[PDB]
């Protein structure tokens, strides 16, 4: 099955930009159908970004213009966050869904900790 590669932690500068890497080697016969990034709120992950057939969707206005997800190379769905705030410190989850040629779906996810440094 696919494996998402995401570092354990990432540190970005206060009021600056950072990239949260999330990559995988695409497998033959696997079609990517959903990409989500989620921020962890206690026990509950909360979607901040969703990519599907219809395009990209940012889920909260506080991210509008600050949030971008790579789309150029298959297998790279890293998340770029600009103008980092102290409140952006959190665990983030990269979550990718694929469909196999028999219609079944496979989901993988992985967690990184975002640190923000003054």
């Amino acid at each position, epitope marked *: *099955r696919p*494996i998402l590669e*995401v570092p*354990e932690s990432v540190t970005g500068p206060w009021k600056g930009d950072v990239n949260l890497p999330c990559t995988y080697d695409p497998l033959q016969g696997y079609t990517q159908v959903l990409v989500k990034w*989620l921020v*962890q709120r*206690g*026990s*509950d*992950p909360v979607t901040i970004f969703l990519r599907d057939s219809s395009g990209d969707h940012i889920q909260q206005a506080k991210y509008q213009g600050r949030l971008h997800v790579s789309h150029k190379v298959p297998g790279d769905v890293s998340l770029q966050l600009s103008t980092l705030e102290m409140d952006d410190r959190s*665990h983030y*989850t990269c*979550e990718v869904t694929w469909q196999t040629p028999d219609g079944n779906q496979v*989901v*993988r*996810d*992985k*967690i*990184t*900790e975002l640190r923000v440094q003054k």
Partner: nanobody
Amino acid sequence: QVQLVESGGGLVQAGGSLRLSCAASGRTFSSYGMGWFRQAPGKEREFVAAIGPFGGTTYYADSVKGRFTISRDNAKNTVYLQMNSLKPEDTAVYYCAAGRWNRYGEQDQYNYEYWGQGTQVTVSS
């Protein structure tokens, strides 16, 4: 860098019980999914059970559901596997493992970043 240490294995009579534990070193134990795998002589390693990060959702292989219980004590950086109604088919080396999956892929061995050294469990008749 993470170090995983299993404790609690050994010899047990069929129908009896054992508790395995795995102590992890590090600062952010609660943000790792923790899993148990086992390998019997002459077979491939297989999933037994897992407990996810944060809230701690539990996952069980069908062959152990109802008989095994997994839990974690985040104050102790420890995960526990309570093994009840043990059968001779449960004889194997049991491995503790730690990964940064969240809600998916918990049975996939490649989804774990750190592997303990494993402890023998033997169920006799």
